[PDB]
Design a protein around this ligand. Structure first.
Ligand SMILES: OC[C@H]1O[C@H](O[C@H]2[C@H](O)[C@@H](O)[C@@H](O)O[C@@H]2CO)[C@H](O)[C@@H](O)[C@@H]1O
Ligand SMILES: OC[C@H]1O[C@H](O[C@H]2[C@H](O)[C@@H](O)[C@@H](O)O[C@@H]2CO)[C@H](O)[C@@H](O)[C@@H]1O
Ligand SMILES: [Zn+2]
Ligand SMILES: [Zn+2]
Ligand SMILES: [Zn+2]
Ligand SMILES: [Zn+2]
Lengths: 529, 529
């Protein structure tokens, strides 16, 4: 579990964690309480896994969209700010961190993506996405490129995909209606097609990610990038002279970034909830607390009501709020992680020429719908191929982690899992399988600690009131169901079946197949021959 | 061990093993004895490892140079042919398979490398190595190359390296003498420099191997290759019209291929020695037996005296004997594998620009000398860095196999072995270490099967009559020697030291750091939640 009398804080690696650690230092000086700030990789996925086991940070920082799912799973303490403290922050920021009426996190700041441009290379940045190809040809001639931004996270491609998004029209027998089809609509496919065509025509590279696009822009190699307020401080220290402006329009529509409220939640398992509350309310959410973080990496527009007319004094924050107004606040429904995973796949499959845009966004909608069913134990798939089938994915491409060690199963291990007729297990509505090493290890442990009895094959037929032929018998070492030949080997070679943990187990063909071995070990240690 | 009443035969994968299996089929028809022919990868190294354990083939085929080492290790039965049978084969072929007076294999055929050339691309093949660069420029212009041959095995580069080889001159104080310096002489460095310059000037690629050079030649892409008689049949079936001629001269000296006598030895552990003898003498070493193999892949010049004046009827065999006469019969001293390993490294390091030619061939000589010392238990190195030091090799580059599983240790594992202060162990004068997986596994097995007693640290000081500070104590899980801090942790946390297999063991810092775990396994098997 978590250490009493100490605060552990997780926050994403692109935020001002160094400034946050200075707030923690001030907290220790004033109170004696030690604060440790960390930024684990993929912390938005690691938090519900470790918090489910009563472990993890005392405080987790993330955009508000993930917190609905955490709250639904019981992972967050209810937040109890006094009325006067609540009145310090914009009402809509509290609304972002409300879950079925209850406050589950403290809002910190409002973030949206903007267009960042090198003023020396591009005094007049383009107002439309459609200008960008021509501008890229001109800049290549000068040994530059027009635009580089992180294509790996759908957060960064969302603004363009969403720009012409819309409801779809429905029709039957002379009668028209309007229908919400999620991301499977013509406008979204239009924007995703435009992004793909940028890659097809070599205006962008599908492999570009955060650090590459950042390096390119801050070294003056590309004229434009797309990024949030946190990225300004690295550009500040670079020699680049940059501006921050409205994202380009697409088909005359504004780009529609998803707006995040950076928020701090308190682990439901923390024994330090009152300390966490004191830190968040009375040290971080002060002028000096937010300034220390913002000086490290800019927060965006802070949630404090006092700074409202100070916001537009900074043009970069005015541009942030302009893009924010043109986009939409992210939902915080518990299934937002399913939405994001489905869209991330659609965009990569599209930008890799794997799917058509239309098929990728149509699968995106139905995969998110299916993943939403992971909450229903009566309808969720418990076989790996059924999972694959319901997610429109080849076994060759599925990503699934071991329930024990959380590593992504390699392709060999995914095949074996399906081949051995094992069952998907759900932890907090996330499906898991198991890797080769964990199955083997816990096969061996299961063997010793749960050794009931042993019988010959003909005895087993009596105990089960079934013939050996169809009876499911798993190998005790690798869990593979024995085939009839392997059962026949048991009978002919007179090997028994062993009752391990309430069922009788056998050995497969493969698993079926020391005075000197130990004595070599002593030579390896130089003890004697 | 080996199966009585059956013959198992190993022969290299470039030989006529399909024809040899037809001889085995005829043997089964006439005698009832089943013959199985196999061609394991690296069989010349696998044979002494498995034959040391009373296992392996009944019969092993290889060039005679490896058989001295096998015989010295007791791996071969003495061969007992009658006087009249011996008179059937050339006396010098029997001499190749004599070991300290005793016959240890049956000779089959005489092999030497030749120059193979595409007559349509090159009616007049060059007589000298020095012509080859100019000829390669001319052929590149036509979209061809001059020469491609296996650069990975020093057998194929030996002819050129040896061409101007010589003894060196010695001098002191007005007095001159001649000295044998092995491969560390000016002529050998000259030839190895010429080969390297062919790679530097893009006349050959250092990565070229057997199958690449073969594919290139048999598809008409390169005008010349270097290969033995076994390679003729694949060229026969290709459309290439080819000739077989004398290797080119270097500095006016003939190329000097090493001449091999393909030979068949009988495993000292075989229970089928009389069957093996009957097969070899009376089925294989007949006109029809050798024809069946030779039709598959040509043998070269067979050892049967009867075919002497039939040899020169085939120009390819006349060219083989001409190159053989210009080269030398390989020695069969037990250390030939050390000679070959040292030269193989020298050539790769040279052709990769890693060493200079002079340093590579000078290290070759001294590494082979050092490896020869592996036979002396009083002088061989028992620490991995001492091994590295004596072989002029970085720990970063050493290749060493696990004594248990024979895998080559990966770089992580080589570092760990040295870091854990473990000892090189010698099996048949070959040095081994151990891989991470084998150490771990046999640490765990050692723990259970050899659990003497347990004591606290201050008790251990009494048992050893030494202070804890310098006392070597290994971690029972990873074998690392505990440092003083780790010993201090034992004392402060009151963990005891465990006597495993006659010495007290501890735990290292790293290794120091279930109703639900087992219950998840039942969901994975679908048995119940
Ligand atoms: O791309 C999907 C990802 O987007 C959002 O994450 C943002 C985060 O809001 C920003 O603060 C910034 O750090 O970049 C992240 C994207 O790399 C969602 O908040 C998140 O749930 C979602 O996975
Ligand atoms: O390259 C070192 C290697 O050379 C010889 O092996 C030859 C063998 O003699 C031929 O019959 C043919 O199969 O090609 C082999 C080279 O790849 C030595 O016989 C062997 O000991 C040595 O390792
Ligand atoms: Zn695992
Ligand atoms: Zn098995
Ligand atoms: Zn091993
Ligand atoms: Zn250890």
């Amino acid at each position: 579990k978590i250490e009493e009398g100490k605060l552990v804080i997780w926050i994403n690696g692109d935020k001002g964690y160094n400034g946050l650690a200075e707030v923690g230092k001030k907290f220790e000086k004033d109170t004696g309480i030690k604060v440790t700030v960390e930024h684990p990789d993929k912390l938005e996925e690691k938090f519900p896994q470790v918090a489910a086991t009563g472990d993890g940070p005392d405080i987790i920082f993330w955009a508000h969209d993930r917190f609905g799912g955490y709250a639904q799973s019981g992972l967050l303490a209810e937040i109890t700010p006094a009325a006067a403290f609540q009145d310090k922050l914009y009402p809509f920021t509290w609304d972002a961190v409300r879950y079925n009426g209850k406050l589950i996190a403290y809002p910190i700041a409002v973030e949206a993506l903007s267009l960042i441009y090198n003023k020396d290379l591009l005094p007049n940045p383009p107002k439309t996405w459609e200008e960008i190809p021509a501008l890229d040809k001109e800049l290549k001639a000068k040994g530059k490129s027009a635009l580089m931004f992180n294509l790996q996270e759908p957060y960064f491609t969302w603004p363009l995909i969403a720009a012409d998004g819309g409801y779809a029209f429905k029709y039957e027998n002379g009668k028209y209606d309007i229908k919400d089809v999620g991301v499977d609509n013509a406008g979204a496919k239009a924007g995703l097609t435009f992004l793909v065509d940028l890659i097809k025509n070599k205006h962008m590279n599908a492999d570009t990610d955060y650090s590459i696009a950042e390096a390119a822009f801050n070294k003056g190699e590309t004229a434009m990038t797309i990024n949030g307020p946190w990225a300004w401080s690295n550009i500040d220290t670079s020699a680049v002279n940059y501006g921050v402006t409205v994202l380009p329009t697409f088909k005359g529509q504004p780009s529609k970034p998803f707006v995040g409220v950076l928020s701090a939640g308190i682990n439901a398992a923390s024994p330090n909830k009152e300390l966490a509350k004191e830190f968040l309310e009375n040290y971080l959410l002060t002028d000096e607390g937010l300034e220390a973080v913002n000086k490290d990496k800019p927060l965006g527009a802070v949630a404090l009501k006092s700074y409202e007319e100070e916001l537009a004094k900074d043009p970069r924050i005015a541009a942030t709020m302009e893009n924010a107004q043109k986009g939409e606040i992210m939902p915080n429904i518990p299934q937002m992680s399913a939405f994001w995973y489905a869209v991330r796949t659609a965009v990569i499959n599209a930008a890799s020429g794997r799917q058509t845009v239309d098929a990728a966004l149509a699968a995106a909608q139905t995969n998110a719908a299916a993943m939403a069913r992971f909450e229903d134990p009566t309808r969720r798939p418990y076989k790996l191929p059924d999972l694959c089938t319901e997610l429109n994915t080849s076994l060759q491409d599925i990503e699934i982690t071991c329930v024990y060690c959380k590593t992504v199963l390699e392709l060999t291990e995914v095949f074996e899992f399906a081949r051995k007729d094992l069952f998907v297990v759900y932890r907090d509505s996330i499906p898991h399988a198991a890797c080769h090493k964990c199955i083997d290890f816990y096969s061996r442990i299961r063997e010793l600690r749960h050794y009931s009895d042993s019988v010959y094959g003909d005895t087993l037929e009596k105990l089960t009131n079934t013939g050996l032929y169809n009876l499911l018998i798993r190998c005790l070492r690798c869990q593979k169901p024995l085939n009839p030949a392997e059962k026949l080997r048991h009978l002919n070679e007179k090997r028994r079946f062993h009752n391990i943990a309430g069922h009788y187990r056998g050995q497969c063909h493969s698993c079926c197949n020391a005075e000197s071995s130990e004595l070599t070990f002593q030579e390896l240690l130089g003890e004697r021959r």
